[PDB]
Amino acid sequence: AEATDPNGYIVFCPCMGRFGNQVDQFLGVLAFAKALDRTLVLPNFIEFKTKMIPFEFLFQVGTVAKYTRVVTMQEFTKKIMPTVWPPEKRKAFCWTPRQAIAEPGCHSKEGNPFGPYWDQIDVSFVGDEYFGDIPGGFDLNQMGSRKKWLEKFPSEEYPVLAFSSAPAPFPSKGKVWSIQKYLRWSSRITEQAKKFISANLAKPFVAVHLRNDADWVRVCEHIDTTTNRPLFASEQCLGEGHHLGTLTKEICSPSKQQILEQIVEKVGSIGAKSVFVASDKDHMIDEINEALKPYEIEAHRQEPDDMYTSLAIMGRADLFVGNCVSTFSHIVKRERDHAPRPSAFFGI
Amino acid sequence: AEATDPNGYIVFCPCMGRFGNQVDQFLGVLAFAKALDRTLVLPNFIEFKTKMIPFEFLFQVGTVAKYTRVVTMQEFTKKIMPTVWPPEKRKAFCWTPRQAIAEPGCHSKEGNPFGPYWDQIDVSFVGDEYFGDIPGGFDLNQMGSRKKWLEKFPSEEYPVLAFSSAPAPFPSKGKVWSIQKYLRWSSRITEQAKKFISANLAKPFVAVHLRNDADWVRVCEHIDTTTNRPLFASEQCLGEGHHLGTLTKEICSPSKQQILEQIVEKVGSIGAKSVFVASDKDHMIDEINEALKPYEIEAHRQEPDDMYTSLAIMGRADLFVGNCVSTFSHIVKRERDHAPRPSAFFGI
C-alpha cells in the first residue's frame, strides 16, 4: 500500500539530442512540474552507443528535491505505477496527432531512442492525448494555461502525464538557467572528477570545451548575422535575443589558430599550470602542447572521454573556456554561475 | 512581373493519412486560410503506390475559389515562388522542434511522403519557425490567436507560411463539414463516374463503402464504449462528442452477416436495381450477389478500384450506405449533404 500524490505525476522521455540538450530541457521540465504541482518522475538520461542512465547515477536526488517534488524512475515503476497507472490507462501526451514515418498519433515509441526508452520501463501506450489547444502548450506562459492543464487533465482520470518528448522549451529560457544549482553531481562522478584532477591537473587549471565534428561545422556555417537570432545555447554569452552582440562563425566554430591563441592567452591570464580538454572529436592535445611548450605546461584529456566526469571536471576548473553555442558548454556555465566561478567563451 | 498577394500565401503537405484524412484536414485548411486572409496554394494530394496528384485533376479550381482565394501549385511554383519566395527564405512551420528519427526542427522532409512531396516542387527548407506559442496553434479558436499569427509572421518577412503537415484539426470539426460543397469533382472524374453508372448500374442504385483490411480491424477492436470518445469520422453518425449514442465495434467493423443483411434491407427499401461496392480490400461481390439473387439484381465494383471515381459514383447514388468511422465515407456523406441526398451507415 503506497500513498500516492493526489495531484499525480509527470514522466517524460528526454528524447531530443545528446546530454546537453537533455539537461537543457530538463531544467524547463522541473519548472513545469513545479508550476503544475505534480510530482516529477526523474528521467533516465539517454546515451548513444541505446543506453539508459538513471538520473541518480549522475546527479543527487536529495539536491534536486530542494527545487520540487520528485521520485526516481525506480520508485515510480515499483511503488507508484502498480497502484495508479495500470496498463489500460497509459496514455501518451504530445502537441497534435502526427503521421508515422499506425493510426495518427504521438508515435511515442517510433524509432530510437523513443521505443527503447519506454521499453526500458515496460510501458506501452493505449491512446494519445493532445495539449496543443492549451495556450502555449507546456509553456505556462499564458493566462489560463496552468488552469487549462488542471481542467483538461485532472489527476483522478489522468494520474500520469506521460510525455513523448520533454515538455520544455528548447533552447532553454533564461528564467530556468538558475535551476542548474539543483543539479549536483553524484558522489561517484565527483570522486572521479577529483581523482583525475589530483592525478593530471596541477592547479590552477584552465578547462576548455572544443566542438568540431562535421555535424557541428555544418550548423555553424548556416549562421545569419543580419537576422542574428539565437542558435542553441548562444544566449549564454550574447544575452537574451542577442542584445549584447552578433553571433559569428568565429564564436560557433573557432579555427585551430583562434583556439590556440585564446588558450595561450587564458593560461597566461591566471598563471595556469595545466590545461584540461573535453571534446566531441578532436581534443587538439598535440597542437595545444606545442603551443604551451614555452609555459612548460601540458594539456590533458580523459581516455576514453567520460562526458559526465568531464563536465564535473570543467565545473571545478579555475577557469573555464567554452563554446558559446554548445548546450554542453551551457551546463558548465550554469554550474559555475549557480552551483560565481569565472567562465569565458571562444571568440568573445 | 507577377503582382502577388500583399497578405501572402499558405502552402502545406497533406502529409497525414490516405485521401480520406487528406480531404478531412483540407476542409480545415481552407477555413484557416480564409481566416488569415492569405491565398491558399492548393495541394498536390498524395497516393501510395509515392504519387502526387494535382488538386485540379480531382476537383474544380473555379468551385473551391468560391470559398476563398486560391492558386494552384502550378501557378504558385511558376508565377509566385520566383518573385516572393526565393530559396533563402524558404522556412518550414510546425508546432515545436522535434528529434529526427539533423538539428532539432520540423523535419519537414524526413521520410515518405514528406520528402517526395517537397521535392516534387523543388523546395528545400533553410530554417524552421514554430507556432506552438500562438494559443491553439492553427485553430484560430481563441481570442488573440488570429492577430498573433499576423503579428508573429508578417507577410513582408513571411510571404509564405509552409506547413510540414496540414494546419487543421484531425478529425475535422463539425463547423468545417459544409465546406465540402466547394469540392466539386473534375470533369474527368464526373465523366468516368457517369460512364460506369450507365454501363453497370441500373437505377435506382445503392452504393456501399466497405472497410475491412487488417489495419482497420485492429483500430476497431480498441474502442472503449464506457468513455465513448470520437474515433476518426464517427461524429458524422453519432453527433458532436457522440451525444446521439455509443460507438460500437458493430459500427466500426460490421460482420459479413451484418453487411449482407443491411444491404438486402436497403435494396428492399428503395427497390434498387443494382449495387455498387467500393472497398479497401474485400468488396464481397460474390457474397452480395448470392444474397441479392432473389431480387434478381447484382453488385458491381470498379476494376482496378479507382478511389476518386468511386467516391464520385457513391456521391451520385440513389442511396449511400457507409462506414461511420471512415473519413473516406465522410467525404461521401458531406458531398451528399451539401454538394440533401439520402445516406445511411452500417450498424446505425
In order, the DSSP letters of B85-101 are --GGG--EEESS-B---
* Residues A220 and A294: beta-carbon distance below 8 Å: no
State whether A170 and B104 contact (CB < 8 Å): yes
Phi-psi region of B164 (alpha: psi -120 to 50; beta: other; left: phi over 0): alpha
State whether A16 and B104 contact (CB < 8 Å): yes
Q: Cα(A50)–Cα(A213) distance, rounded to whole angstroms?
A: 21
Q: Cα(A180)–Cα(A191) distance, rounded to whole angstroms?
A: 20
Q: Which helix (H) or strand (E) holds A312?
A: helix A307-316
Are A102 and A85 in the same domain?
yes
Q: Which of A130, A161, A185 is the last residue of a domain?
A: A185
Are A45 and A142 in the same domain?
yes
* Residues B13 and B116: beta-carbon distance below 8 Å: no
Chain A residues with beta carbon closer than 8 angstroms to that of B108: none
Does a cis peptide bond (omega within 30 degrees of 0) precede residue A171? Answer: yes
List the grid coordinates of B29: 485548411
- β-sheet with B70-71: strand ranges across: B70-71, B39-41, B9-12, B160-163, B92-94, B128-130
Name the binding residues of B for substrate. 18-21, 209-211, 327-328
Are A179 and A319 in the same domain?
no
Question: Residue B105 forms beta bridges with which residues?
Answer: B98
State whether A132 and B133 contact (CB < 8 Å): no
Are A148 and A241 in the same domain?
no
- First-to-last CA distance in chain B? 57
Task: Please count the other Cβ atoms lying within 10 Å of the Cβ belonging to residue B84.
Answer: 17
State whether A112 and B101 contact (CB < 8 Å): yes
Q: Which of A185, A218, A248 is the last residue of a domain?
A: A185
Are B271 and B153 in the same domain?
no
Chain B residues with beta carbon closer than 8 angstroms to that of A110: 101
Q: B3: which residues sit within 8 A by CB, 6+ positions away?
A: none
Chain B residues within 8 Å of chain A (Cβ atoms): 15-17, 21, 95-99, 101, 103-104, 110-112, 114, 126, 132-133, 135-137, 139, 141-142, 165, 170, 219, 222
Q: B116: which residues sit within 8 A by CB, 6+ positions away?
A: B50, B52
Are A313 and A213 in the same domain?
yes
Are A154 and A239 in the same domain?
no
Chain A residues with beta carbon closer than 8 angstroms to that of B133: 136-137, 139, 141-142
Q: What experimental approach yielded this model?
A: X-ray
State whether B110 and A101 contact (CB < 8 Å): yes
* CA of B242 vs chain A CAs: smallest distance (Å): 18
How many domains, in total, are found in chain B?
2
State whether B135 and A137 contact (CB < 8 Å): no
CATH number at residue B223: 3.40.50.11350
Are B177 and B30 in the same domain?
yes
Q: B45: which residues sit within 8 A by CB, 6+ positions away?
A: B14, B19, B22, B52, B53, B55, B58
Are B144 and B231 in the same domain?
no
In angstroms, this model's resolution equals 1.7
Cβ contacts from A onto B, under 8 A: 70
State whether B219 and A135 contact (CB < 8 Å): no
Q: Cα(A121)–Cα(A123) distance, rounded to whole angstroms?
A: 6
Are A169 and A131 in the same domain?
yes
Are B300 and B281 in the same domain?
yes
Q: A172: which residues sit within 8 A by CB, 6+ positions away?
A: A24, A25, A27, A28, A330
Dihedral sign, Cα of residue A202, residue A206, residue A212, residue A216: positive
CATH number at residue A45: 3.40.50.11340
Are A19 and A114 in the same domain?
yes
Distances (CA, A) of B243 to B228, B234, B239, B326, B333: 10, 11, 6, 19, 19
- Domain span at residue B202? 186-348
* CA of B342 vs chain A CAs: smallest distance (Å): 30
Q: Which residue type sits at B245?
A: G
List the grid coordinates of B66: 468560391
Q: Which of B152, B167, B185 is the last residue of a domain?
A: B185
